[PDB]
Write a protein that binds this ligand. Sequence first.
Ligand SMILES: C#CCCCSC[C@H]1CN(Cc2c[nH]c3c(N)ncnc23)C[C@@H]1O
Ligand SMILES: C#CCCCSC[C@H]1CN(Cc2c[nH]c3c(N)ncnc23)C[C@@H]1O
Lengths: 232, 232
Amino acid sequence: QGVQKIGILGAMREEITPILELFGVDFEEIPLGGNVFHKGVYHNKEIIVAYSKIGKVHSTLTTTSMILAFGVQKVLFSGVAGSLVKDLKINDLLVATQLVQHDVDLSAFDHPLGFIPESAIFIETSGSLNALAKKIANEQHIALKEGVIASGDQFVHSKERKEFLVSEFKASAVEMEGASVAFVCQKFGVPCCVLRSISDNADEKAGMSFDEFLEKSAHTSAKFLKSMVDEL
Amino acid sequence: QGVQKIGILGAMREEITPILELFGVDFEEIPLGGNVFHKGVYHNKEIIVAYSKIGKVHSTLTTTSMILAFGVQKVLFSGVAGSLVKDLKINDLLVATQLVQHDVDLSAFDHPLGFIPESAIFIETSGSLNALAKKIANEQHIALKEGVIASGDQFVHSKERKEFLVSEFKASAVEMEGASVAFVCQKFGVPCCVLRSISDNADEKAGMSFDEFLEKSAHTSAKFLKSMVDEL
Ligand SMILES: C#CCCCSC[C@H]1CN(Cc2c[nH]c3c(N)ncnc23)C[C@@H]1O
Ligand SMILES: C#CCCCSC[C@H]1CN(Cc2c[nH]c3c(N)ncnc23)C[C@@H]1O
């Protein structure tokens, strides 16, 4: 019965800026493994906030550091994502129920795409945290979608790649970190929730949309993440 | 002036089997984060041996665990790889001077392939360890090549992808973990050496070659890694 330690992660500095602002507490900055961890006290909880830097290796490293070096008991991810489905519009929020590494390819050995031996195609997130997210969204009258998020080390900006992610994985959104964060948490037995707000449609205009909406979408996700932390 | 702690990593169980056999000491098995770490004493050094499981996320996690949980001061990687160049034949040994994540693509933002903001295309390994490898190889009359290794989350088995790795990155060999291991070590300031023995030619017949030569090539790499540890 110590103080609860909660890890809060984004991929980009822009994804954690609104998180730090919204919590409004003093943070100690602690450098480790190329990341800066922002350690603060919020209600009866220790919150450790960081951005990993972009992509799967960065996010895997940072999540592992949060767990081993800072002793976090839960990890909440907040950031932006590309939409793969018509009903997920710019600014909409989605919670990932499962995630996949969409760029993994061991098909030379007849493995399905996404699969690595001693693992699985789909990585689950925390049912209790996802239930909390849904409960809060319903009380606040916020549309919150749930579905599969695909993660890879490419920025997706083509109709062809979008359609593959939908056909192969039944994914709803695409990003570059969720699956790796969720994977690390699964390996250590740490509950994980991945929240994303849509910044673009993962098509030919995605780069321009992303630049336009990163701030607003990052804020939308951050505000929702704070509302979850308020109930922990 | 404690005992030197050396991390020894492979990707697959088959890559560490000969390592454990060759060191010939008693190991304590310690489970953590979905890996099993084999901790032993060899001469005046503590050796921590593990296989990460395949690919970039697995290897990033395991390397981070080795550094944070086991306090390793150096990391030596041993395993097998696909050859991209005519002069690297089955069983030949290569030490990686730089590594790249060949599947990273942020070209939508006009970044070169392999590049992520706040990082670099090429990750360096330890010059002092690579010099040690070359010195030992020369004394033992072992051909040891050096060059760039490309790492990604795909098993490469096509002429077309091989040629891309050579054209884009001037890579000599391909695998799925070196760049991520070397990256983590760079972030923590830990010296890293990546050794690989060729198992296949990364072409249409690579899967069959890999299955045939994994054992022999893994042993070749392991034997050389042991010879390095003998000089540390
Ligand atoms: C800085 C800079 C330019 C490179 C930004 S890469 C895109 C970042 C946003 N994030 C989520 C994302 C939003 N739209 C996406 C898309 N269309 N494809 C992949 N990921 C995303 C992944 C990564 O951290
Ligand atoms: C078990 C099993 C079947 C899947 C094995 S994936 C290949 C493993 C060997 N390793 C190195 C490698 C050897 N030949 C390769 C190739 N042709 N492409 C990518 N990696 C490799 C990467 C990964 O750990």
